[PDB]
Symmetry: T
Subunit: 70 residues, 12 copies
Amino acid sequence: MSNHTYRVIEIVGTSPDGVDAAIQGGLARAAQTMRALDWFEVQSIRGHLVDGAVAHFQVTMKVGFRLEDS
Amino acid sequence: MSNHTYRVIEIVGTSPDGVDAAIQGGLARAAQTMRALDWFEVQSIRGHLVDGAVAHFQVTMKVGFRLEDS
Amino acid sequence: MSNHTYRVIEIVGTSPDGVDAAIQGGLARAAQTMRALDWFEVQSIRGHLVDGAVAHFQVTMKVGFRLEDS
Amino acid sequence: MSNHTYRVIEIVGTSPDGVDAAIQGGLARAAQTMRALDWFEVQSIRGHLVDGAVAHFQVTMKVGFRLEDS
Amino acid sequence: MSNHTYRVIEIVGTSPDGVDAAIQGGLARAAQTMRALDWFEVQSIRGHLVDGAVAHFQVTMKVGFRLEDS
Amino acid sequence: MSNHTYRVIEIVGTSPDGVDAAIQGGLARAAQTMRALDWFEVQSIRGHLVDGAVAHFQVTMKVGFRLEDS
Amino acid sequence: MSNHTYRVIEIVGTSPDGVDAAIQGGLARAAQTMRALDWFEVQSIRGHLVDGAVAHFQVTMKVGFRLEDS
Amino acid sequence: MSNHTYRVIEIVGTSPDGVDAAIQGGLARAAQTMRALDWFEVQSIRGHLVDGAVAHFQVTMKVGFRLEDS
Amino acid sequence: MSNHTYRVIEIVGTSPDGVDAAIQGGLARAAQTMRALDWFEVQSIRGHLVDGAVAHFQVTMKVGFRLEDS
Amino acid sequence: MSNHTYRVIEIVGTSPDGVDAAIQGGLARAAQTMRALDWFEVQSIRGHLVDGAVAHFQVTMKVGFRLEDS
Amino acid sequence: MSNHTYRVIEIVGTSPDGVDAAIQGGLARAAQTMRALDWFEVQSIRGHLVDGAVAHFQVTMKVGFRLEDS
Amino acid sequence: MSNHTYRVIEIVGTSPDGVDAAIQGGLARAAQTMRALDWFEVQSIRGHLVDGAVAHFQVTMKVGFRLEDS
Ligand SMILES: [Cl-]
Ligand SMILES: [Cl-]
Ligand SMILES: [Cl-]
Ligand SMILES: [Cl-]
Ligand code: NA
Ligand code: NA
Ligand code: NA
């Protein structure tokens, strides 16, 4: 690596099934329309409540991928 | 949302199961008293150990709800 | 101050009229039933949107007041 | 929210008329070509000067919007 | 611990005799009117001056205790 | 900028008329005897109270200016 | 405790099955060779991606234990 | 500067040479696409190792540019 | 407090006695020059060691005072 | 120094008699078995409470020392 | 050290030749008109761009020196 | 990885020739005695000054490596 640049994106996964589901969900959505993802760093784990249960988990994470062509 | 006001307190949720559990359990007691929980936010994930096993996951949280009374 | 023992709570004042407004309402609402609020400290400035205009600013502030000693 | 996958970007709105103004323009300009901006979050309040008067305030804010899922 | 929840409170101890006195003082006031306290985490050590000496030490700390009944 | 060596100092502007006001006075007062202030950066927004109304906002800001080089 | 002194080392747990597993996994290792660990503290949650899906989570935490005998 | 708006993204610059190189290289690709880079800000300096030698310096950066279109 | 302005500088206080001493000593010299010290704030507690004894406690502080001149 | 390299370990000092004692206490231990410690840095000040009073303070710090000979 | 106080100043070095040049440059300017400097701690590494290259590196650092006379 | 577990130690690199050298220097040492280090992470950049010039930089970072075999 001497000329390998990365782009760091921010997404917020959500799911009623917990942190891992949320992380997993958000990530599939990125890789979906984005080029080979490489890593993710969680920024925060939030949430909304209804009856008094976690309506949905919100896991903000930073996602990195490589840029290439030429 | 006209000009409501919110209250943010800090509860520590605990469970042997894991993070999700600890949070869910923590939010359980908080709601059992309070005034429709609107949102929560994880401050940290700690845990107590006995030997080579997690005794209890400790997920400290910030929960916000309504205070827009009169 | 040698017997002075203060208590710091957290609140989130909202307002469609900016930070100043959001701060002002929150604190007003707070005292409107609570004690003699001494000071406040801004934790974060956020907001919810609709189009490209802030429906309401969200200033969460830590507030403190002198407790009772005898 | 279980399919909701948001994207948080960062912007810096400027204004010679204070924080409120700087925040307002930034977000307006943002949506003026972008999607349905959900929320925003203040990262920093800065400013460039000339004499002893703020030429323009600089509010950098993280902004998020719902992505597309199907 | 599977169903052991905690509440995290904020107090500001004060004393002219230093950090430890301040911590000690504030804590006695909490335990005084509060249920069995469990731990405290210092948040900040501030102070006010008179002749040029620490009029009073201010040690903000977070205090945790257990919630129980049934 | 290769000889430009700036000095960053910290100040706290106060005002009963909100953040904007507090920021404005502080900087004005600063230059009213000091050099050519280049930029400023908000450290914290606080305030002292009386009833439930801010007696004066307290914006502490880091300010910088170009030093002298020859 | 009374005069106990503890060491805080820093490990990183990894697992294909989420935070809990990585947390649990990492500790087991520390326990395999270290005297009764007392507590852990999550420092971060990251993960490598060899594709659209998660290759495996990485939970980095600080583990604390005592030391005294003679 | 009337009331322009800026965009801040995050790139990771890499180089075996060192920090300076990694940043310079990172900024190279960022500019090669974007819209006159105004400023950058280092978020962290990381690096990959093979044995007893630095494989690649990794300087993550925040780059800001213009978005004041219409 | 009409619309005063304050100045915040950073001194490092030192003492073999302990934290309290180091701070008290640090504030001593600061005041011996400056302009009625209003408040202080501890930034960190460090210390130098020779062998198995604390050589000197180092408490870095932020001291604020008046600058509301004309 | 010139080409020295240091290790930073992390210990936790505890004492029934305040911060100083815990700080002092903890170090002594590190010194008891580690080659001339050079510096320490307070990371936190916490404490357990078995009642209204402080059972004992807990001061967690990072201790640094060198390593070179051959 | 029982009565050794320090002052902590803030400067922003600049240079087109990288972080080290910038650090080096800013420091010479301080020591130039200031009394024996003792240490510096980097606060941030920023920069401005022209053609798309680092017009100049900006390294904000905190500089410490001793105060003495009598 | 799959079930790997890593240790993060913390070293400090020093050099008369800037950040790179100190970074490079420090690591070499860790490598001299530690099994194939995998990654490093800059925690700070400081330096001692025995005069107007830099005596030598001090780069403190966290180095990570694995551990597993049996
Ligand atoms: Cl907090
Ligand atoms: Cl960020
Ligand atoms: Cl600071
Ligand atoms: Cl750390
Ligand atoms: Na989980
Ligand atoms: Na460099
Ligand atoms: Na003390």
